[PDB]
Short mmCIF file of C-alpha atoms in Angstrom, two decimals:
data_model
loop_
_atom_site.label_atom_id
_atom_site.label_comp_id
_atom_site.label_asym_id
_atom_site.label_seq_id
_atom_site.Cartn_x
_atom_site.Cartn_y
_atom_site.Cartn_z
CA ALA M 1 47.49 5.55 -13.48
CA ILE M 2 46.33 5.84 -17.12
CA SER M 3 43.67 7.94 -18.88
CA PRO M 4 41.62 5.68 -21.15
CA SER M 5 41.69 6.52 -24.86
CA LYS M 6 38.08 5.42 -25.36
CA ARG M 7 35.04 5.51 -23.03
CA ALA M 8 31.57 4.02 -23.37
CA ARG M 9 28.62 5.89 -21.86
CA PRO M 10 27.04 3.41 -19.40
CA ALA M 11 23.38 3.03 -18.44
CA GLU M 12 22.18 5.12 -15.49
CA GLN H 52 10.39 2.75 -21.47
CA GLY H 53 9.29 -0.23 -23.56
CA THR H 54 12.55 0.11 -25.46
CA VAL H 55 14.22 -2.35 -23.08
CA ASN H 56 15.73 -5.63 -24.31
CA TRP H 57 14.84 -5.41 -28.00
CA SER H 58 16.26 -7.83 -30.53
CA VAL H 59 18.50 -6.41 -33.24
CA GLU H 60 15.89 -7.61 -35.70
CA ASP H 61 13.18 -5.50 -34.06
CA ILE H 62 15.48 -2.49 -33.95
CA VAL H 63 16.16 -2.87 -37.67
CA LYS H 64 12.43 -3.21 -38.30
CA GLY H 65 11.63 0.07 -36.55
CA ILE H 66 14.53 1.97 -38.07
CA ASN H 67 13.52 0.97 -41.63
CA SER H 68 9.91 2.07 -41.02
CA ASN H 69 9.91 5.68 -42.34
CA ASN H 70 8.00 6.62 -39.20
CA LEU H 71 10.22 9.08 -37.37
CA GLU H 72 8.71 8.20 -34.00
CA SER H 73 9.09 4.47 -34.69
CA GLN H 74 12.69 5.23 -35.66
CA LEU H 75 13.17 7.22 -32.47
CA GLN H 76 12.02 4.41 -30.19
CA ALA H 77 13.99 1.77 -32.10
CA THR H 78 17.08 4.00 -31.85
CA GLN H 79 16.57 4.32 -28.11
CA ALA H 80 16.32 0.53 -27.91
CA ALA H 81 19.70 0.38 -29.66
CA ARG H 82 21.15 2.92 -27.23
CA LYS H 83 20.08 0.70 -24.32
CA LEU H 84 21.51 -2.48 -25.81
CA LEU H 85 24.71 -0.61 -26.58
CA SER H 86 25.00 0.91 -23.13
CA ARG H 87 24.92 -2.37 -21.22
CA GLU H 88 27.92 -3.54 -19.21
CA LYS H 89 28.08 -7.19 -20.29
CA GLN H 90 29.03 -7.72 -23.94
CA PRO H 91 27.01 -5.02 -25.69
CA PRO H 92 26.28 -6.41 -29.20
CA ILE H 93 28.36 -3.83 -31.10
CA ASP H 94 29.26 -6.16 -34.01
CA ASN H 95 25.65 -7.36 -34.42
CA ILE H 96 24.53 -3.73 -34.61
CA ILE H 97 27.28 -3.02 -37.18
CA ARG H 98 26.38 -6.11 -39.26
CA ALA H 99 22.73 -5.04 -39.37
CA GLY H 100 23.86 -1.96 -41.32
CA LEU H 101 22.56 0.47 -38.69
CA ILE H 102 25.48 2.94 -38.65
CA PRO H 103 24.50 4.95 -41.77
CA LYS H 104 21.01 5.27 -40.30
CA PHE H 105 22.31 6.54 -36.97
CA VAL H 106 24.55 9.01 -38.77
CA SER H 107 21.63 10.36 -40.83
CA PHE H 108 19.71 10.75 -37.57
CA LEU H 109 22.41 13.10 -36.20
CA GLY H 110 21.26 15.61 -38.80
CA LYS H 111 17.61 15.62 -37.77
CA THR H 112 17.57 19.12 -36.26
CA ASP H 113 13.78 18.91 -36.07
CA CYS H 114 13.94 15.82 -33.79
CA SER H 115 16.42 16.43 -30.94
CA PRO H 116 15.68 13.18 -29.04
CA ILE H 117 16.76 11.00 -31.98
CA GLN H 118 19.87 13.16 -32.43
CA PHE H 119 20.65 12.37 -28.80
CA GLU H 120 19.85 8.67 -28.96
CA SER H 121 21.92 8.09 -32.08
CA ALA H 122 24.82 10.18 -30.74
CA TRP H 123 24.88 7.99 -27.64
CA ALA H 124 24.57 4.79 -29.74
CA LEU H 125 27.39 5.86 -32.08
CA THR H 126 29.51 6.89 -29.09
CA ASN H 127 29.37 3.41 -27.64
CA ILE H 128 30.19 1.79 -30.98
CA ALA H 129 33.17 4.15 -31.44
CA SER H 130 34.41 3.23 -27.96
CA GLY H 131 35.05 -0.33 -29.16
CA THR H 132 37.97 -1.75 -31.15
CA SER H 133 39.72 0.13 -33.94
CA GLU H 134 37.66 -1.79 -36.49
CA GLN H 135 34.50 -0.76 -34.65
CA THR H 136 35.64 2.86 -34.38
CA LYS H 137 36.46 2.74 -38.12
CA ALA H 138 32.90 1.65 -39.01
CA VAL H 139 31.60 4.79 -37.28
CA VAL H 140 34.07 6.98 -39.18
CA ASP H 141 33.33 5.19 -42.47
CA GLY H 142 29.64 6.07 -42.06
CA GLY H 143 30.57 9.77 -42.14
CA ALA H 144 30.01 10.38 -38.41
CA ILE H 145 32.85 12.88 -38.11
CA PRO H 146 31.41 15.93 -39.87
CA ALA H 147 27.99 15.05 -38.46
CA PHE H 148 29.30 15.11 -34.88
CA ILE H 149 31.19 18.35 -35.53
CA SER H 150 27.97 20.01 -36.73
CA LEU H 151 26.38 18.85 -33.48
CA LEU H 152 28.89 20.77 -31.35
CA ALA H 153 26.85 23.89 -32.14
CA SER H 154 23.56 22.37 -30.92
CA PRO H 155 21.41 24.42 -28.49
CA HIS H 156 20.87 21.27 -26.42
CA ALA H 157 23.83 20.86 -24.05
CA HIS H 158 23.22 17.11 -23.61
CA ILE H 159 23.54 16.73 -27.39
CA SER H 160 26.68 18.87 -27.85
CA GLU H 161 28.13 17.00 -24.88
CA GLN H 162 27.39 13.67 -26.55
CA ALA H 163 29.07 14.88 -29.75
CA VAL H 164 32.14 15.94 -27.75
CA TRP H 165 32.26 12.47 -26.19
CA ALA H 166 31.97 10.71 -29.57
CA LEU H 167 34.67 12.81 -31.17
CA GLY H 168 36.89 11.98 -28.17
CA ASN H 169 36.43 8.25 -28.87
CA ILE H 170 37.23 8.64 -32.54
CA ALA H 171 40.32 10.78 -31.90
CA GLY H 172 41.29 8.37 -29.11
CA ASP H 173 41.73 5.57 -31.62
CA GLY H 174 45.14 6.74 -32.83
CA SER H 175 47.03 9.45 -34.68
CA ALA H 176 45.33 8.97 -38.07
CA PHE H 177 41.79 9.42 -36.73
CA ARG H 178 43.00 12.16 -34.37
CA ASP H 179 44.40 14.04 -37.36
CA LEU H 180 41.26 13.34 -39.41
CA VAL H 181 39.04 14.86 -36.70
CA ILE H 182 41.34 17.92 -36.76
CA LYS H 183 41.18 18.17 -40.57
CA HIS H 184 37.35 18.22 -40.38
CA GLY H 185 37.67 21.32 -38.19
CA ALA H 186 36.72 20.06 -34.74
CA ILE H 187 39.11 22.25 -32.74
CA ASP H 188 37.40 25.64 -33.27
CA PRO H 189 33.88 24.58 -32.19
CA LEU H 190 35.33 22.59 -29.28
CA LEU H 191 37.30 25.60 -27.99
CA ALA H 192 34.25 27.85 -28.43
CA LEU H 193 32.41 25.70 -25.89
CA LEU H 194 35.05 26.81 -23.36
CA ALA H 195 35.07 30.49 -24.37
CA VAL H 196 33.47 31.67 -21.12
CA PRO H 197 34.64 34.08 -18.39
CA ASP H 198 34.55 31.41 -15.66
CA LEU H 199 34.73 27.64 -16.30
CA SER H 200 32.81 27.11 -13.05
CA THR H 201 29.58 28.19 -14.73
CA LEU H 202 29.73 25.06 -16.88
CA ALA H 203 28.24 21.73 -15.85
CA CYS H 204 30.86 19.54 -14.19
CA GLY H 205 30.20 16.48 -16.37
CA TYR H 206 30.22 18.59 -19.54
CA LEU H 207 33.54 20.29 -18.66
CA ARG H 208 35.08 16.90 -17.82
CA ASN H 209 34.06 15.47 -21.18
CA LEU H 210 35.48 18.46 -23.06
CA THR H 211 38.79 18.23 -21.18
CA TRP H 212 39.06 14.51 -21.87
CA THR H 213 38.38 14.94 -25.57
CA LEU H 214 40.91 17.79 -25.86
CA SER H 215 43.52 15.54 -24.23
CA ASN H 216 42.88 12.95 -26.93
CA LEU H 217 43.69 15.56 -29.58
CA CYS H 218 46.98 16.03 -27.72
CA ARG H 219 47.59 12.30 -27.57
CA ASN H 220 49.76 9.83 -29.51
CA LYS H 221 52.90 9.92 -31.62
CA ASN H 222 54.14 8.74 -35.03
CA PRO H 223 53.22 11.43 -35.80
CA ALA H 224 52.75 13.84 -32.90
CA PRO H 225 49.74 16.17 -33.37
CA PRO H 226 50.11 19.06 -35.83
CA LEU H 227 52.03 22.01 -34.40
CA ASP H 228 49.32 24.53 -35.30
CA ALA H 229 46.71 22.33 -33.62
CA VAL H 230 48.80 22.15 -30.45
CA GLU H 231 49.39 25.91 -30.62
CA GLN H 232 45.63 26.45 -30.91
CA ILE H 233 44.68 24.15 -28.04
CA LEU H 234 47.40 25.19 -25.55
CA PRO H 235 45.95 28.42 -24.05
CA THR H 236 42.70 26.57 -23.26
CA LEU H 237 44.64 23.68 -21.68
CA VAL H 238 46.67 26.13 -19.57
CA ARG H 239 43.36 27.49 -18.29
CA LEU H 240 41.90 24.03 -17.57
CA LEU H 241 45.11 23.25 -15.65
CA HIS H 242 44.07 25.99 -13.21
CA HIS H 243 40.50 24.69 -12.72
CA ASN H 244 39.36 23.34 -9.31
CA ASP H 245 37.91 19.97 -10.40
CA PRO H 246 40.09 16.89 -9.71
CA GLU H 247 39.08 15.13 -12.95
CA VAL H 248 39.60 18.17 -15.18
CA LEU H 249 42.98 18.65 -13.46
CA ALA H 250 44.00 15.02 -14.06
CA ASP H 251 43.00 15.04 -17.73
CA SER H 252 44.65 18.40 -18.31
CA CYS H 253 47.83 16.94 -16.83
CA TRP H 254 47.51 13.89 -19.08
CA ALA H 255 47.23 16.29 -22.04
CA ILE H 256 50.37 18.14 -21.01
CA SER H 257 52.11 14.80 -20.47
CA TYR H 258 51.30 13.81 -24.07
CA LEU H 259 52.47 17.09 -25.59
CA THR H 260 55.82 16.93 -23.71
CA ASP H 261 56.46 13.34 -24.80
CA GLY H 262 58.69 14.05 -27.81
CA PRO H 263 61.51 16.26 -29.17
CA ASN H 264 62.64 19.37 -27.24
CA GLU H 265 60.72 21.68 -29.57
CA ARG H 266 57.41 20.24 -28.39
CA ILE H 267 58.56 20.49 -24.77
CA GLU H 268 59.59 24.12 -25.40
CA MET H 269 56.10 25.10 -26.61
CA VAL H 270 54.73 23.88 -23.29
CA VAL H 271 57.45 25.31 -21.06
CA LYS H 272 57.21 28.72 -22.69
CA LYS H 273 53.52 28.85 -21.71
CA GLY H 274 54.67 28.98 -18.07
CA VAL H 275 52.86 25.85 -16.83
CA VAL H 276 55.84 24.34 -14.98
CA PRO H 277 55.11 25.93 -11.58
CA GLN H 278 51.50 24.79 -11.84
CA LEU H 279 52.65 21.29 -12.79
CA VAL H 280 54.92 21.32 -9.72
CA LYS H 281 52.02 22.36 -7.50
CA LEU H 282 49.92 19.52 -8.96
CA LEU H 283 52.87 17.18 -8.25
CA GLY H 284 52.09 17.76 -4.59
CA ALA H 285 48.39 16.87 -4.81
CA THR H 286 46.81 14.26 -2.54
CA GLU H 287 44.97 12.66 -5.47
CA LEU H 288 46.98 9.91 -7.18
CA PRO H 289 45.20 10.41 -10.50
CA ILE H 290 46.53 13.99 -10.55
CA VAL H 291 50.04 13.22 -9.28
CA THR H 292 50.55 10.48 -11.86
CA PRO H 293 50.20 12.56 -15.07
CA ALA H 294 51.80 15.58 -13.38
CA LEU H 295 54.88 13.50 -12.55
CA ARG H 296 54.98 12.08 -16.10
CA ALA H 297 54.88 15.58 -17.58
CA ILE H 298 57.67 16.75 -15.28
CA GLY H 299 59.68 13.64 -16.20
CA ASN H 300 59.15 14.42 -19.88
CA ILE H 301 60.39 18.00 -19.50
CA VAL H 302 63.66 16.93 -17.87
CA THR H 303 64.50 14.71 -20.84
CA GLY H 304 65.01 18.02 -22.65
CA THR H 305 67.74 20.66 -22.50
CA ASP H 306 69.64 21.68 -19.39
CA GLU H 307 67.71 24.96 -19.58
CA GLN H 308 64.31 23.21 -19.59
CA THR H 309 65.49 21.02 -16.73
CA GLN H 310 66.47 24.16 -14.81
CA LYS H 311 62.89 25.49 -14.95
CA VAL H 312 61.60 22.36 -13.22
CA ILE H 313 64.22 22.85 -10.50
CA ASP H 314 63.57 26.61 -10.22
CA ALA H 315 59.87 25.83 -9.73
CA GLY H 316 60.65 23.76 -6.63
CA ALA H 317 60.13 20.24 -7.95
CA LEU H 318 63.00 18.66 -5.97
CA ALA H 319 61.21 19.43 -2.68
CA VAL H 320 58.44 16.96 -3.53
CA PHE H 321 60.87 14.14 -4.29
CA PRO H 322 61.37 12.96 -0.69
CA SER H 323 57.69 11.88 -0.84
CA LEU H 324 57.76 10.70 -4.46
CA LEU H 325 60.85 8.53 -3.92
CA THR H 326 59.11 6.93 -0.95
CA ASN H 327 55.65 6.73 -2.55
CA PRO H 328 53.81 3.47 -1.79
CA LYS H 329 52.65 3.30 -5.40
CA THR H 330 55.32 1.40 -7.37
CA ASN H 331 54.85 3.27 -10.63
CA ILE H 332 55.17 6.68 -8.92
CA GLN H 333 58.41 5.61 -7.25
CA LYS H 334 59.82 4.21 -10.49
CA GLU H 335 58.84 7.27 -12.55
CA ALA H 336 60.24 9.60 -9.89
CA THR H 337 63.53 7.70 -9.81
CA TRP H 338 63.75 7.78 -13.61
CA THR H 339 63.27 11.55 -13.45
CA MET H 340 66.01 11.77 -10.82
CA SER H 341 68.41 9.92 -13.15
CA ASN H 342 67.76 12.44 -15.90
CA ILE H 343 68.37 15.27 -13.47
CA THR H 344 71.67 13.70 -12.33
CA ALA H 345 72.56 13.63 -16.04
CA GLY H 346 72.45 17.44 -16.00
CA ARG H 347 75.02 20.11 -15.14
CA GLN H 348 77.09 20.08 -11.94
CA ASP H 349 75.07 22.92 -10.40
CA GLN H 350 71.98 20.79 -11.03
CA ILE H 351 73.65 17.81 -9.35
CA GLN H 352 74.36 20.25 -6.52
CA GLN H 353 70.68 21.10 -6.09
CA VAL H 354 69.93 17.39 -5.86
CA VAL H 355 72.49 17.30 -3.03
CA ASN H 356 71.16 20.45 -1.36
CA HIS H 357 67.62 19.08 -1.29
CA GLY H 358 68.89 16.04 0.61
CA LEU H 359 67.97 13.67 -2.21
CA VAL H 360 71.13 11.58 -2.20
CA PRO H 361 70.04 9.59 0.88
CA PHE H 362 66.70 8.98 -0.81
CA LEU H 363 68.61 7.52 -3.75
CA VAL H 364 70.60 5.32 -1.37
CA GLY H 365 67.26 4.24 0.10
CA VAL H 366 65.79 3.39 -3.28
CA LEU H 367 68.95 1.51 -4.21
CA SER H 368 68.84 -0.35 -0.88
CA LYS H 369 65.23 -1.46 -1.14
CA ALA H 370 62.67 -1.02 -3.91
CA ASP H 371 60.98 -2.79 -6.81
CA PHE H 372 63.85 -3.98 -9.05
CA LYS H 373 62.94 -1.73 -11.98
CA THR H 374 63.07 1.25 -9.64
CA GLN H 375 66.44 0.05 -8.31
CA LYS H 376 67.53 -0.11 -11.96
CA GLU H 377 66.63 3.54 -12.45
CA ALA H 378 68.45 4.40 -9.21
CA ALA H 379 71.62 2.76 -10.50
CA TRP H 380 71.25 4.86 -13.67
CA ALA H 381 70.82 7.92 -11.43
CA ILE H 382 74.10 7.09 -9.67
CA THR H 383 76.18 6.36 -12.79
CA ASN H 384 74.94 9.62 -14.32
CA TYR H 385 75.76 11.39 -11.05
CA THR H 386 79.26 9.87 -10.99
CA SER H 387 79.83 10.65 -14.66
CA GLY H 388 78.92 14.34 -14.48
CA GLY H 389 79.66 15.20 -10.86
CA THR H 390 82.66 16.86 -9.22
CA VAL H 391 85.11 15.01 -7.01
CA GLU H 392 83.49 16.62 -3.96
CA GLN H 393 80.01 15.56 -5.09
CA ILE H 394 81.19 11.98 -5.75
CA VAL H 395 82.90 11.71 -2.34
CA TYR H 396 79.67 12.93 -0.68
CA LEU H 397 77.88 10.01 -2.35
CA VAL H 398 80.12 7.41 -0.71
CA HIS H 399 79.73 9.20 2.63
CA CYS H 400 75.96 8.78 2.25
CA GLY H 401 76.50 5.03 1.97
CA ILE H 402 76.19 4.30 -1.75
CA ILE H 403 78.79 1.54 -1.91
CA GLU H 404 77.12 -1.33 -0.06
CA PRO H 405 73.71 -1.25 -1.79
CA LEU H 406 75.56 -0.77 -5.07
CA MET H 407 77.64 -3.89 -4.40
CA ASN H 408 74.56 -5.91 -3.40
CA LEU H 409 72.91 -5.29 -6.77
CA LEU H 410 75.87 -7.00 -8.46
CA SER H 411 74.16 -10.32 -7.69
CA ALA H 412 71.31 -9.31 -10.02
CA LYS H 413 70.20 -11.34 -13.04
CA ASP H 414 70.13 -8.36 -15.38
CA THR H 415 73.14 -7.62 -17.57
CA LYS H 416 72.48 -3.91 -18.18
CA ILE H 417 72.33 -2.93 -14.50
CA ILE H 418 75.60 -4.83 -13.97
CA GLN H 419 77.07 -2.69 -16.75
CA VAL H 420 75.59 0.49 -15.26
CA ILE H 421 76.92 -0.32 -11.78
CA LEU H 422 80.43 -1.29 -12.89
CA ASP H 423 80.58 2.03 -14.74
CA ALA H 424 79.55 3.87 -11.57
CA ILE H 425 82.19 2.28 -9.31
CA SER H 426 84.71 2.89 -12.08
CA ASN H 427 83.81 6.59 -12.00
CA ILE H 428 84.09 6.66 -8.21
CA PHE H 429 87.57 5.14 -8.35
CA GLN H 430 88.58 7.76 -10.92
CA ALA H 431 87.56 10.31 -8.30
CA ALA H 432 89.47 8.46 -5.56
CA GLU H 433 92.70 8.78 -7.57
CA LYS H 434 92.57 12.58 -7.53
CA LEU H 435 92.70 12.28 -3.73
CA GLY H 436 95.23 9.49 -3.27
CA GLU H 437 92.51 7.59 -1.42
CA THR H 438 91.89 4.71 -3.82
CA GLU H 439 93.12 2.35 -1.10
CA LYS H 440 90.31 3.23 1.34
CA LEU H 441 87.71 2.47 -1.35
CA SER H 442 89.17 -0.92 -2.22
CA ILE H 443 88.83 -1.95 1.43
CA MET H 444 85.28 -0.58 1.76
CA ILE H 445 84.29 -2.58 -1.33
CA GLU H 446 86.15 -5.63 0.02
CA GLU H 447 84.42 -5.37 3.40
CA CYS H 448 80.82 -5.26 2.12
CA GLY H 449 81.52 -8.42 0.13
CA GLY H 450 81.86 -6.47 -3.10
CA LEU H 451 85.20 -7.84 -4.29
CA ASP H 452 83.88 -11.41 -4.18
CA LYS H 453 81.05 -10.19 -6.43
CA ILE H 454 83.42 -8.48 -8.87
CA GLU H 455 85.73 -11.52 -9.09
CA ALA H 456 82.76 -13.66 -10.10
CA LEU H 457 81.96 -11.12 -12.83
CA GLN H 458 85.33 -11.82 -14.49
CA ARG H 459 83.80 -15.09 -15.70
CA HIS H 460 80.49 -13.66 -16.88
CA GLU H 461 78.68 -14.48 -20.13
CA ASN H 462 78.73 -10.93 -21.49
CA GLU H 463 81.96 -9.29 -22.61
CA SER H 464 81.44 -5.66 -21.63
CA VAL H 465 80.99 -7.23 -18.20
CA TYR H 466 83.99 -9.59 -17.88
CA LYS H 467 86.38 -6.87 -19.10
CA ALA H 468 85.19 -3.98 -16.90
CA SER H 469 85.45 -6.35 -13.93
CA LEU H 470 89.00 -7.57 -14.62
CA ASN H 471 89.86 -3.97 -15.52
CA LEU H 472 88.75 -2.78 -12.06
CA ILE H 473 90.61 -5.72 -10.52
CA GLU H 474 94.06 -5.21 -12.05
CA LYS H 475 94.04 -1.45 -11.40
CA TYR H 476 92.63 -1.21 -7.84
CA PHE H 477 92.65 -4.64 -6.18
CA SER H 478 96.20 -5.78 -7.01
CA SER B 3 72.49 16.06 -22.50
CA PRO B 4 73.84 12.87 -24.14
CA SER B 5 73.24 10.93 -20.93
CA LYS B 6 69.52 11.83 -20.80
CA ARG B 7 67.49 8.64 -21.28
CA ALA B 8 63.95 8.01 -22.50
CA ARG B 9 61.35 6.27 -20.34
CA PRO B 10 61.78 2.51 -20.81
#
């Protein structure tokens, strides 16, 4: 629906 | 991995130690705190004055792990609020991340790509600042390969996403030379087989076409329309969504640009789009229809030929109200630009009753739009001497009762247009 | 052309 403008890199 | 659950105080202690290994493990501890789902302590890390340290660590060519750890840490800080993104930029992270794009370690260049994407993603000013620092060339060089398929999937996805953020936002739109420079790589990503790359490439194209016709023209002249149309027919909703938005954007442009969407076969997908169970797809598709019915007569004719008028009657008969609103716009545009023959066809498809039913609505603009439409349809009925048949049709479906009531409406564009219709056709 | 609308 929307592409996020910011993205955190999560823990594995 | 004894770098789990450190305090900020202990992290600061290790980072200020002048022992590179101590710094490395304390930086990893920060990465772990910052990569947690629940309320990562971004502000506490910022207040501790750690950002300049992390940034300096990006330049430690001799210690790749700490380059990685700090890149990750800074990435997660830049993913926060604008104020948090700004603290990363203010520490000089931008040129440091750009230098990292040339790293021999793929997991480090990837992390730099990611971070730059977060900074550019903040808004037009940071987007343009990342461009000014010269990010585009080293980013595009990462994709200068014979076959994209030789690249790691995750890596390629990150690059595509970051490129789309350089395409993103308005006031101002991205610099023309930047867009020119990025386009041929985007066109190529748009032909890649990965669903996520495809989606993000479509988002990128959607951004670039959101503006004045000159931006749209740059995209259209690259020949991506047929490929957009193909992607319109994908099974994956996250591909269809930005593909439909891009197509919608293009038909806001000239009649010529709108013709390329039609020539590419877009109208054939609309039976599905206009019945899509996702509300936003149906609404966006109906909006796009309205802009097509605002085109030339031959373009109205292709809407007819593709059997799309009954789908518009359907949407007008039953849909989310905002979609019904777009459908009314589609009809008024149709009735404003269409021929007599095309307008008559509309009635024959059953437009009158669902049109009349929407007169009960609690929105003033759609009342205005509808009254305009029926006015246009009467003006077509005159040129046939069959205005009498229409009056009765409208009387039978309970329409006249609805129009009478509109003579005593709050708004003035409304109460006039009503009474106007009354005195000319129902008296 | 003049009847083209922007996304609302």
